[PDB]
Amino acid sequence: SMSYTWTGALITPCAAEESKLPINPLSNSLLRHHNMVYATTSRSASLRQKKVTFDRLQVLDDHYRDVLKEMKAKASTVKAKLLSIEEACKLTPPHSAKSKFGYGAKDVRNLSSRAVNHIRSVWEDLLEDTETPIDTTIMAKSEVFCVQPEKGGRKPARLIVFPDLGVRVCEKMALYDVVSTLPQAVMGSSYGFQYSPKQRVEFLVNTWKSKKCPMGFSYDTRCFDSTVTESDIRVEESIYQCCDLAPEARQAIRSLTERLYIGGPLTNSKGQNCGYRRCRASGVLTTSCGNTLTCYLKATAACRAAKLQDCTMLVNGDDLVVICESAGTQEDAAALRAFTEAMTRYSAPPGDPPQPEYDLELITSCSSNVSVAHDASGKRVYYLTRDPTTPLARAAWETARHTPINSWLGNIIMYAPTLWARMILMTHFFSILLAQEQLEKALDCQIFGACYSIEPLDLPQIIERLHGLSAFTLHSYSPGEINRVASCLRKLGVPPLRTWRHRARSVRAKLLSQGGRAATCGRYLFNWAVRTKLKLTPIPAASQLDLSGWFVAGYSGGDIYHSLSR
């Protein structure tokens, strides 16, 4: 079973494609080495195709079946509701790809006559037609990175595969509630997306110390989406079907499984047939949930087969971290080898072989890792950090050119406590915002694949609820962390960290001398940069004004939007 068949037609771009940074003088002294920063394009689509096209052998054993049944039993607990056309319509992102049938995302959210009447047809057809493969578009995704340490080495583009907008709304009607409810109900504390980064670190540590002599590792599968088999996709549906479901929902889920989720024809932006998918589509609603369940399933079964002891996992789509209990250094080396054999049999082979780890801080997953600093009281605080190379490069790109997605806003939020977010990314972007006019203009950023509309004057209260008060008051970061950031600054040509302390005062001052929501941003955010720090007490609006829905589920590739928060 091949993940992909290709006809020969190209993955084409739909417009103009940017690949290098522009000669922009206030990307400037964010970053001067612009040769380092690039964006992926259609040109490298072929290279990705080769990487992502292969046969899939799958051998299921008693462990897999045993784990499946325990999952289904947990799933049998769930009752899932059918969404109405109006509710699914509201979940649609303002700049989601328009339909072939002469209407766009705007028309959907307005409940336009042409849009809801097409949507009803797609739904009715899901009921009348039970097997005809549903069309998708394949495209190259444009992502920014920093040139790889073997001389301008480069990641090729990712392929994004999605059905027409009308189908996307129907998926929401049938599977939105399911996808927001079932993963937690099945996987419990092992479901990553229920955790704020503060809750995430809290669960990591707690699990680590609950161990005699802990041992953890992270597992990376070689292009997970392609490893997912038609069997996997069906096993997945069998889990969904354990929910209490409306009869049309049940049919809709059944049809979407056979007509879309298991595979179907690929069409480029020119209308040409590119070939056929028999693996996971990156851009359907079920992609995160389905991946999270499928990764959790294969891994739990692989642990048992590998005879690892007191495995706890934390799963986030295809990102997988295991914290378990160590039988004596070449104990696990062997046990991981076994684990890897089992994952490989289940059709989930690794990228780089997994390595046992006996220091929590050295384990990296979700691109991130735990580090330690201290807050005013001097007490050791645990926080979640990351190599800043890709965020700092993306920040430079977003300065130089306009873009819907502002990942910088996202990294500030998610990595508020980190040294590099506070000194560089807050300082730089509040300066730009200050000088421009734009402190109130809400911006779109993504958390867990779902886009959010967010006002930058609400970071002090967002940061406080998601990270606590220590996020503004942390100071004596580890030598390892500080050395990563300093190193990353050299590689990119970002000015040294002491450079930013100077800049951060001016920005703080230009923003205390403004008052209001501005004012607050200068008190707590840039407190690290003043000479005799003032005493920061908890913000009022933080609690009884801001709201959930934020760390409930993973929605990557699922066309999901909340205009939640500010």
Curated annotation (Swiss-Prot):
Cofactor comment: Binds 2 magnesium ion that constitute a dinuclear catalytic metal center.
PTM annotation: The N-terminus is phosphorylated by host PRK2/PKN2.
CC cofactor: Mg(2+)
Residues in RdRp catalytic domain copies: 214-332
Annotated binding of Mg(2+) 2, by residue: D220, D318, D319
Compartment list: Host cytoplasm; Host endoplasmic reticulum membrane
Regulation: Activity is up-regulated by PRK2/PKN2-mediated phosphorylation.
Modification type Phosphoserine: residues: S29, S42
Bilayer topology term: Single-pass type IV membrane protein
Catalytic activity: RNA(n) + a ribonucleoside 5'-triphosphate = RNA(n+1) + diphosphate
Its biological purpose: RNA-dependent RNA polymerase that performs primer-template recognition and RNA synthesis during viral replication. Initiates RNA transcription/replication at a flavin adenine dinucleotide (FAD), resulting in a 5'- FAD cap on viral RNAs. In this way, recognition of viral 5' RNA by host pattern recognition receptors can be bypassed, thereby evading activation of antiviral pathways.
Oligomeric and partner information: Homooligomer. Interacts with non-structural protein 5A. Interacts with host VAPB. Interacts with host PRK2/PKN2. Interacts with host HNRNPA1 and SEPT6; these interactions facilitate viral replication. Part of the replication complex composed of NS2, NS3, NS4A, NS4B, NS5A and the RNA-directed RNA polymerase.
Name this polypeptide is given: RNA-directed RNA polymerase
Portion of the full-length sequence here: 2420 to 2985 of 3010
